[PDB]
């Protein structure tokens, strides 16, 4: 009546070295392809083995201190070295839309089954750091998961949100805080330090438009946000910007004050806002917000309401989530907000009470 890890030691005295499958096919990987056992075999050996060890995290001790000194097992040096070349090949080129349907799901199933097992192996699996002592293709893995924004290219975004991309902003938050404490984070930071400078500048000018027209930029925006929103549960996003951009996400606020004059965008451009505010008001401050609530309160039929439109519209943006944005820092902050009395502003205040009404009672 033992428990797993204690029972393992009596087995090694017998047949211990090499018990999951060691000959995993490799050489017939030409440009041949098919939904034949060209995608089921290699991905059945992979999801079976990346599991027999993922679940073996409780017996995870005598199996990395002993599956890394397992040079003769021929398993690990194929599980890894292939899947890193194998993983890279799938990401590059996949090669009848139904044959590519089953192609994109069984590969999205391999990547994350590796990736959160990359979470497990990077955090509590190593008490002796047995893989940070040995990685032979630790570079290919970088070139894809960071495409957490351009991921609608390797896997589908509408086809991915079910099952996977419900689990995926999970895998990312699990993987980003996994290296962050490790000595392998500062290695990836150099890599990640690539998506903000090439984006800060183009997204800025490419958003102001009358109608829809430019639509391929309307998604990378939500992507620049989608991947940023998963980055607030990690590290480093606090390092890339407080350089001289502490009050810059406030210019992103002026960017919101920008599209006020031009006819309105409809109920779908309406949805974007965290990037508009949830992304900016999670690294930037909340006082320069109040300083815009009441500070922007400073200011035949057509030019009449324009006096009353930076008087009408500013209030409208200020609503929805911006009122709940107060809740994150509002203890103590409102006695300052409520003391200033430009005009009765307490009107918008009950907007705070309303969303509290909603959650509780």
The two tokens of residue 292 are 């815009």
Nearest to residue 256, comparing CAs of 220, 229, 281?
281
Solved how? cryo-EM
In the block, tokens 């930029």 appear at 217
Q: How far is CA 302 from the centre of its chain?
A: 45
CA-to-CA distance for 280 and 85, rounded, in angstroms? 38
Which DSSP state fits 286?
Answer: S
Which distant-in-sequence residues (6+ apart) come within 8 Å of 154 by Cβ? 91, 108, 111, 144, 147
Other C-beta atoms lying within 10 Å of the C-beta of residue 341? 9
The two tokens of residue 107 are 């590969």
Which DSSP state fits 20?
Answer: S
CA-to-CA distance for 198 and 101, rounded, in angstroms? 32
For 13-25, b/e burial (b = at least 16 CB within 10 A) is: eeeeeeeeeeebe
CA-to-CA distance for 343 and 191, rounded, in angstroms? 50
Contact (CB, 8 A) for 185 and 177: no
Rg of the chain over CA atoms, in angstroms? Answer: 26
The two tokens of residue 284 are 């930037």
DSSP-H helix ranges across the chain: 5-12, 41-52, 76-92, 97-122, 142-145, 151-154, 164-180, 185-192, 197-200, 202-205, 216-229, 251-258, 280-283, 287-293, 302-307, 313-317, 321-327, 333-339, 346-359
CA-to-CA distance for 167 and 179, rounded, in angstroms? 19
Contact (CB, 8 A) for 224 and 203: yes
Contact (CB, 8 A) for 78 and 130: no
CA-to-CA distance for 241 and 189, rounded, in angstroms? 14
CA-to-CA distance for 361 and 357, rounded, in angstroms? 6
Nearest to residue 249, comparing CAs of 290, 277, 208, 218?
277
What are the backbone dihedrals phi and psi of residue 220, each rounded to the nearest 5 degrees, phi first? -60, -30
CA-to-CA distance for 23 and 75, rounded, in angstroms? 7
CA-to-CA distance for 20 and 12, rounded, in angstroms? 14
CA-to-CA distance for 71 and 78, rounded, in angstroms? 11
The two tokens of residue 21 are 């499958």
Other C-beta atoms lying within 10 Å of the C-beta of residue 280? 22
The two tokens of residue 241 are 């910007």
């Amino acid at each position: 009546k033992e428990e797993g890890v204690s029972f393992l030691i009596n087995t090694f005295e017998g047949g211990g070295c090499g018990q999951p499958s060691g000959i995993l096919a490799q050489p017939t990987l030409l440009y041949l392809r098919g939904p034949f056992s060209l995608q089921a075999t290699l991905c059945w050996l992979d999801l079976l083995l990346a599991a027999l060890e993922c679940y073996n995290t409780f017996i995870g001790e005598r199996t990395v201190g002993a599956l890394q000194v397992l040079g003769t097992e021929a398993q690990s040096s194929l599980l890894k070295a292939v899947a890193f070349f194998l993983e890279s090949i799938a990401m590059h080129d996949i090669i009848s839309p139904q044959e590519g349907e089953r192609y994109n799901y069984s590969k999205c199933t391999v990547v994350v089954r590796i990736m959160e097992f990359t979470t497990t192996l990077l955090n509590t699996s190593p008490e002796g750091w047995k893989l940070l002592k040995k990685d032979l293709c630790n570079t290919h893995l970088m070139r894809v998961l960071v495409q957490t924004l351009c991921e609608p290219a390797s896997i589908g975004f509408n086809i991915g949100d079910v099952q996977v991309m419900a689990h995926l902003p999970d895998v990312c938050v699990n993987l980003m805080k996994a290296l962050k404490m490790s000595p392998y984070k500062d290695i990836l930071e150099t890599h990640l330090r690539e998506k903000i400078t090439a984006q800060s500048i183009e997204e800025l000018c490419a958003v102001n438009l009358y109608g829809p027209d430019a639509q391929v930029d309307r998604s990378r925006l939500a992507a620049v946000v989608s991947a940023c929103k998963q980055l607030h549960r990690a590290g480093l996003l606090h390092n890339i910007l407080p350089s001289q951009s502490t009050d810059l996400h406030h210019s992103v606020g002026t960017e919101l004050l920008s599209l006020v004059y031009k006819g309105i965008a409809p109920g779908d451009e309406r949805q974007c806002l965290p990037s508009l505010d949830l992304s900016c008001k999670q690294l930037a401050s909340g006082l320069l917000e109040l300083a815009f609530a009441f500070g922007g309160l400073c200011e035949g039929s057509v030019i009449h309401f324009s006096h009353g439109e930076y008087f009408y519209s500013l209030f409208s943006e200020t609503i929805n989530t911006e009122l709940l944005k107060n809740l994150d820092l509002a203890v103590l902050e409102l006695m300052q907000s409520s003391v200033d009395n430009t005009k009765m502003v307490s009107a918008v205040l009950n907007g705070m009470l309303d969303q509290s009404f909603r959650e509780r009672a």
